[PDB]
Amino acid sequence: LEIKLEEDLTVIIGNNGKGKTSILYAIAKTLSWFVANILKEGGSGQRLSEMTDIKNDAEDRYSDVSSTFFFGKGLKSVPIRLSRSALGTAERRDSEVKPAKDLADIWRVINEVNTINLPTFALYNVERSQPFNRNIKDNTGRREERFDAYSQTLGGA
DNA sequence: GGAAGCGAAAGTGTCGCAACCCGAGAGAGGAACGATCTCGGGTTGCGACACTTTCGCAACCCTTAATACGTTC
RNA sequence: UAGUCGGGUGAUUAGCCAGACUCUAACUUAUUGAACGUAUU
Numbered sequence A: 001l002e003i004k005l006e007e008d009l010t011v012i013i014g015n016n017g018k019g020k021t022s023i024l025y026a027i028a029k030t031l032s033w034f035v036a037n038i039l040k041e042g043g044s045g046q047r048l049s050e051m052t053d054i055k056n057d058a059e060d061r062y063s064d065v066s067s068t069f070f071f072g073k074g075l076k077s078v079p080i081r082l083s084r085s086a087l088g089t090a091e092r093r094d095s096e097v098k099p100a101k102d103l104a105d106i107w108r109v110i111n112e113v114n115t116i117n118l119p120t121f122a123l124y125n126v127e128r129s130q131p132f133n134r135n136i137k138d139n140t141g142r143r144e145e146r147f148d149a150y151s152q153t154l155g156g157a
Numbered sequence B: 001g002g003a004a005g006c007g008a009a010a011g012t013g014t015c016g017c018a019a020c021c022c023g024a025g026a027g028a029g030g031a032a033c034g035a036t037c038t039c040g041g042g043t044t045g046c047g048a049c050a051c052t053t054t055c056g057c058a059a060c061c062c063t064t065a066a067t068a069c070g071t072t073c
Numbered sequence C: 001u002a003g004u005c006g007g008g009u010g011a012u013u014a015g016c017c018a019g020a021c022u023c024u025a026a027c028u029u030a031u032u033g034a035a036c037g038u039a040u041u
């Protein structure tokens, strides 16, 4: 499948079980690498599942999620591919996540020397809308700290 | 292909809390014996969370290269 | 309208001017090796 998302707004529609949540899940998995490498140097983002993400009746027994990002005319293409081979397969498939690491390294290093505005990556799945009680006192982490805005930002809730 | 670090992802054990049960006990009433509510352990079920295992990113570039100037793989 | 092509000007990778295009739709890449162009030769 191939998608040509718009710059400002993209709306995916269809029946139930057509793969819209799959597309959003793949995009969030791709963006987790940007978030992880913004937070840490060489940080590891989320990866495709080897139990449920590979097509059940695929012959190859691996799955790919390729993406291309645009960051202006000076950086027109940032290709990142997330791959996973099925469970119990001798040949494993690697992920090409180097360009995302490079872009996030640029962001983080430039931010360290002089504060710059950082991009916001957020996923709001169906996993939200759970009840909300004010049960969060010792929640460990410091909410004023600037880089707390990336904590659990692609979890869904 | 894959050091060395490290973290994601998934599975499994564990451990504390709630909920209930069950015997002991002081003693309500009203004229005695012991109702009824509570104290102290004890058991079980359950679910959040800690702990455990596996995978994967990607150093280096091996003895072993050539060195007019430019694109391309 | 975007986006793209690029003839001119421009101490010139920028800015501007004229013109043109539009399959749902470029993202310019790699040496010393191979071939191509060029120079010595």
Ligand SMILES: Nc1ncnc2c1ncn2[C@@H]1O[C@H](COP(=O)(O)OP(=O)(O)O)[C@@H](O)[C@H]1O
Residues within 6 Å of the ligand: A014, A015, A016, A017, A018, A019, A020, A021, A022, A023, A052, A053, A054, A055, A056, A057
């Ligand atoms: N590994 C798989 N192999 C084959 N089909 C799958 C696999 N994983 C999910 N599906 C199918 O893809 C659909 C997933 O639904 P989803 O992406 O949430 O769609 P929606 O947004 O329309 O509700 C289901 O119809 C499910 O049967």
